[PDB]
Structure formats: C-alpha cells, structure tokens
Symmetry: C3
Subunit: 102 residues, 3 copies
C-alpha cells in the first residue's frame, strides 16, 4: 500500500476532493489537519494556513489517483507526494483492498 500527501488552500476544496476520491474508491480513507505553510512563490516567501491531507490506497492505483487529483485540485501546481508503506498489519491492508476499486 502507499500513502499520498497533498495540501489544499482551505477545507471546502480539501473535503470536496477527498470525498470525490472516496466515492470513486481511489483511496480507502484520508486523514486531514491544518498546518501553517511557508513556501517560495515567484520571488516571495508566502505564508498561509493550509489543510494537509494524508491519503491511503493501493500501489497499483497510484497513477490513476495522481491523474485524478491533478484534474480535481484547486492549486495549479499541487503537491502529490507518494510514500510507499514498508509494512502494515494484515487486517488493515485487507480492509483497504476491499474498500478500493476493483
């Protein structure tokens, strides 16, 4: 399985995207929380509150998920970071597999 990290400008866009991903069963679930972001943007160090999102899905769904997020994401240049899970309890993995598209 893998985890994907992305950020949103606010909660409305975040939940909208996440729910769409769940309805299409491209992810088994997501953990969202706010954070203070500091980043470079066109010669300036911007500061802004964001909603960070941790998504859980299968490895074979990675490409389809990334492409789907690029279509739904409010940011023109969003972060879609994949981090593989080295291991996980079997019961949870089976659940994640059952919850995602066939």
């Amino acid at each position: 399985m893998i985890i994907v990290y992305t950020t949103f400008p606010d909660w409305e866009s975040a939940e909208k995207v996440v729910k769409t991903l769940l309805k299409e069963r491209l992810i088994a679930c997501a953990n969202l929380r706010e954070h203070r972001a500091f980043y470079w943007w066109e010669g300036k160090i911007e500061e802004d509150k964001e909603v960070g999102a941790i998504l859980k899905t299968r490895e074979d769904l990675w490409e389809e998920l990334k492409e789907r997020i690029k279509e739904l994401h409010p940011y023109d240049v969003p972060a879609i970071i994949r981090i593989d899970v080295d291991d996980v309890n079997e019961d949870y993995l089976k659940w994640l597999i059952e919850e995602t598209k066939k």
Copy 2:
C-alpha cells in the same frame, strides 16, 4: 529507524497506549495531534475526529511493536503503518537506539 503511524478515537486511549509502549520501551518517542478522518462507514462517507500518533523506534522492534499495538488498541481494525526512515541525524539515532529495549 522506522516511523509507525496509527490513529485513536480519543486522547485517553492514545496517551494510555503510547505511554505503555514507552514504558515497555518499544518506542523511544511519539508525536500526537488531532486530525479529521474520512472513510466509508455504514454505506456512507463519514467524517470522524481522531488523534493521530507518529511513533519512532528501531526496525528490529517492528514485529513486537505491531503485535503489542494490536493487543492494546481500542479499534478493532487499527491502522499500524510502518515507514522506514531513509536517513536521520546520527546523534538522534544513537539516542533512539539507547532508549529502546534490547
């Protein structure tokens, strides 16, 4: 070293479990913070407040830690995700190894 991510329904259980893992020295440290979880429950997409926990320990203690978490976790099918640390400052790693069980 490795990081282990799991979630709890509340702070009581989260701290109780983490302090127990610390006491038995299965981990050297934990970071706890709330988040909003989204997943399928009862044929509907549910949103639920949780306490996420990031645990830090050694790779060789993974299996034992995983089993221990299963025995103590309040959820019936908790997420016990292992993510290997690619690199880290070695004075911190020395500390982590020294604080964990033989």
Copy 3:
C-alpha cells in the same frame, strides 16, 4: 525529492529556523503544525508541546540541510528525519527544484 521531519519547542523558533532555511533556499517549503510529544529522557518519560515541521527539498541538499538545521535548532539533539519520496508529479517537482539553490 525528500521530506524532512523535525520538531521545535515553540512557534517562535520553528518559524525563525524555517524562514532562514527558505532564505538560504535549502528547502522549497515547510508545513508547520502542533503536536504533543512523549519521549524518554534520562530515565524519565517527558511530555512536551511542540511544533512539528515537514520540510520539502531536493535529495542532493540533504547533507547541507541537516547540517544547517543542526547549527540553528534550539534542541541539543533534535529530530532531523529524512523520508525519500517514491514518486511525485513532475510539475510540482520542477517548482521545488527551481526554488532550491543550485
């Protein structure tokens, strides 16, 4: 690219360090959010509030970043954890590469 996780005792130090890392272009961006820490410290389980920081930068900048964080960080033995990103959307990657020093 890589993700670097570190923690700070307060917002003042976290913001100061992160802004310097950004002005030196050792990182393209940072996400700061609070958490409660539980860890072993010389025979006792300590409890402390912290500001966790997720840093994003290029792999080749890892060594230099770790060294700079070490020189700036308020903790004597801070956590500077590196997790490699298995994959990411190229357009986002280009932005991150462009904003970090050559």
